[PDB]
Symmetry: D2
């Protein structure tokens, strides 16, 4: 198409409106190079751990972006502080590859990330990464399923670019995405049934055998947080990954898994809570700390939040 709106075209155009440095545009532009290379790595990752190529890949793109200064990964003990010659004003927490164990089973997988801005005056440091998800300037994720897709949520909206493999470009296909109010799907790991706290288990019931002589909800669970969240954003519904006996803190890590999705969700008009508080309003203490996550089409999640303090 002759006037293909790319991601990079798109970003750059909303960055001119901030009267900025062009770094978001460098960052995201670099970010995309790690996403294509990984997407390719997976489409033949089987013809002849991936996590480590993917992690080394994202660090290196981000360093050379000349736009970051602290990078937090799933895969590294401490934060990464960027060399001065290459430093910039942004902080990116990222999970290079979420549900990696599931590549084997040809499960839709993803990269998740979230970009904060270093506001303070001193030596960049992990503390700079201890900011509540509410403060994110930009978020989103890249999905590696039947097509490689990158949903990017910034201060004006959620938008979905789809990688056109014929040209190596992310092309904008869905604009100013908004989630349905209520939907017909719930998503949760039902094998943890024994371990679920009362509010959840009631709500599960409330949906399975609805007391309204209406249709029951449908259930889905791909077991790859990205696929289930993207399904939620688009078809509408709910996804849950609650604090239980196995993991009293939720399994999903905050800064890189929960807060991006939370941000994407709320900007889309969804909600995302822990059942006791909003995910984004949570102040991180550890950069690797976890959280309970219920996110989805507002009315459903609210149904649960009532059920949470109707059992309180």
């Amino acid at each position: 198409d002759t006037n293909i709106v790319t991601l990079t075209r798109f970003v750059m155009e909303q960055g001119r409106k901030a009267r900025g440095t062009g770094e978001m545009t460098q960052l995201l532009n670099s970010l995309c190079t790690a996403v294509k290379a990984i997407s390719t790595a997976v489409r033949k990752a089987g013809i002849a751990k991936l996590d480590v190529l993917s992690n080394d890949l994202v660090i290196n793109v981000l360093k050379s972006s000349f736009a970051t200064c602290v990078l937090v990964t799933e895969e590294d003990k401490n934060a990464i502080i960027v060399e001065p010659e290459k430093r910039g004003k942004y902080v990116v927490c990222f999970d290079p590859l979420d549900g990696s164990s599931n590549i084997d089973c040809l499960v839709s997988i993803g990269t998740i990330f979230g970009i904060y801005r270093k506001n303070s005056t001193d030596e960049p440091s992990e503390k700079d990464a201890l900011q509540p998800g509410r403060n994110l300037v930009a978020a989103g994720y890249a999905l590696y399923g039947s097509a490689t897709m990158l949903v990017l949520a910034m201060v004006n909206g959620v938008n979905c670019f789809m990688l056109d493999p014929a040209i190596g470009e992310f092309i904008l296909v869905d604009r100013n995405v908004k989630i349905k109010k209520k939907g017909s799907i719930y998503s949760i790991n039902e094998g943890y049934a024994k371990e679920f706290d009362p509010a959840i288990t009631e709500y599960i019931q409330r949906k399975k055998f609805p007391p309204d002589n209406s249709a029951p909800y449908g259930a889905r669970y791909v077991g790859s947080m990205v696929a289930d969240v993207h399904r939620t954003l688009v078809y509408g519904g709910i996804f849950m990954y609650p604090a239980n006996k196995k993991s009293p803190k939720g399994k999903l890590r905050l800064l890189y898994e929960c807060n991006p999705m939370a941000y994407v969700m709320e900007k889309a008009g969804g909600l995302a809570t822990t059942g006791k508080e909003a995910v984004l309003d949570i102040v991180p203490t550890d950069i690797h700390q976890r959280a309970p996550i219920i996110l989805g089409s507002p009315e459903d999640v609210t149904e649960l939040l009532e059920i949470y303090q109707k059992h309180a």
Copy 2:
């Protein structure tokens, strides 16, 4: 990098057709199915930048025909089994769904193409009665998956083999020979929104994996919600995939002829049983080419840990 000895499926299945002397009619058929499958994947990967299932149905038909190896074809999408015109005739019956889960593209959940093939057990001029052979007379069944990769999984007599699509040379390349599923797993895959309508044999089984009575792990719940994805997580990692009957689809939802049976053949050829519940899915006499049938599958100790309870409730 650059490997001079690439085992393309066209090479591979020739090492199955030729040493057993049958013309390899099988091969120009499958080769063509490769084109149908390739083409469906590329378009599905740019799907959101350009119904699909119709065109992929029509794709499959056209290529199948020209393999010069067919006589009857049954689609999920077409009523009367397409009897091939005489000029291009051959001996096989291909029962196929072109695009299983064609709804779920827009949510980027993996989807696929299933196929089952028979060889004509008749002297005549063809009819869909040729098509109405039970699973136990399947010469070969397979499916293709459009997930993070394009994987064809092909089951023929010796066993099952999984192939992956190298996009750069356009060839299915072999990545697993003589595949065998596990014995016991730790997954049960079923849509529990239909909780109410489940026959109580299943309803106990769910509780026995959720709340193990003998205090083991609770099984892990999974359900991508596309038959093709679910069989695959089950074939490789093991697990029990259960799509029993409920009342809303009271004789089940999955159409025997090209869904439950191709799966089932692939599945049983790897060490797991595919049963409706009462009988094994491969021996039901195929009545309507769109005849539906329930199906439960995977690694045997789970198919059976349930089977005996299905026998303990009638």
Copy 3:
């Protein structure tokens, strides 16, 4: 966009093998050559980011063998014609150069793979004597080009057909049926660095195109310098491509068996003659599989406007 009726060469040549009843042995052979060719192109396109001709030679061999349709193979790159091991035997002789102009990759000038095939005219157990058949007994010749596109051009009995590689589905798709070259052109293609050493028949011809005696246009000089590119500009746009003999390669440079002959068959099947100068290139008795021979080709009025002067100087 998305076309359900793609004429893949595997489909197309089946509409030539099957209606003339011959087993289509031709087809699993060619299908395999497609893989060899595909694979060479992808690696040539990332060539500068990863000798090649060796590996492409070895590629071609391996795939050819497994087509289960060969018995002898001759490479530019291998001395003794590779007689195939018995288990995978079939009836064809494939004379091929895997990577014509393999030097010129680094300058990004187009290059290719030429192939010529024979069918064994003997009862025996094979030998390269089977290979030593003249061009006039070629069952089919073709070449593949790695230029701005990957074009296979296939000449078999009915005529020549040009196919292009759709990279997205990995299939050669037909873009020109029953091809015919022009009658007269306005191009002469020859390396005039060798000016001194040219036999004076050619030396007059050059002046007759450069300085037309009858005051027409001067012909347009072209010379990519890779045999494959030069035949193609000649096959479609017409022209005369002349690689005569000089002293430095006094019996010519181009090896009959897989260069001048495959070209020649393709070429003559489209309406142009391929002559050494004295005799047509297709009838010389093939002595050494690496026997060299001169060659001049293209649209006939030019091959002939020179031929008579070659007859006017001996």
Copy 4:
């Protein structure tokens, strides 16, 4: 490769050293999107004028780059002046597709361009494009042969990036390219033999039947200026397209065909003259004016330049 040096990485890094606006980097980054899309268009341009997609493509990328203000094409009567909301400090003359007629014959083809900087204070205008090629800040071309290649010549050197089709990125493969002093190839349209002026025709001879009992030169001519120049840059040699009877001004247009190649050549250590003067030292009067072009491995071209004024 985990630390893939891209074109964009490369450009951006040499732009930080200018302490600049980041526009070269936007320009070139956009430019590359027109190059991939065209490269794809050609690799299946036959499965079912191209010039017009290609031209509309390059204009539109360049407008949206937010880095240009005047764009001169092979294919458009007047120059293109960029809308103010989108204007920037650069001028690009380009030929979107050179030797288009030869796509048919699967001839290696290319895009050629050259980037000048608008130095004056007033309304951008064609005059801004009437600057001698000597002033170019950046030049290069993109070749569409067995692989898509982009040679970029800037103030520090000539370098060749090769498009990695698996990721949609131009990867740097040849650095600080320098041409061989003398080589064994000449390139010229020999069918114009009748029409060539004396200096040329002597030199042709001088090479064909060398009076030194040495080997004669080899001759090549693909008939697609890009392929022959790239061959010259790499294998070394000479290429000529002289003023004759048919075209007393040379066929090749200056601003978009001759000056880019000239620039690339001289930076590479080659020369490029008209036989009477250097191509780059020529002041354009028309934006669509032509020039005689002899370019290649210095000693050879000098051999001809002697022969030019040894017949004067």
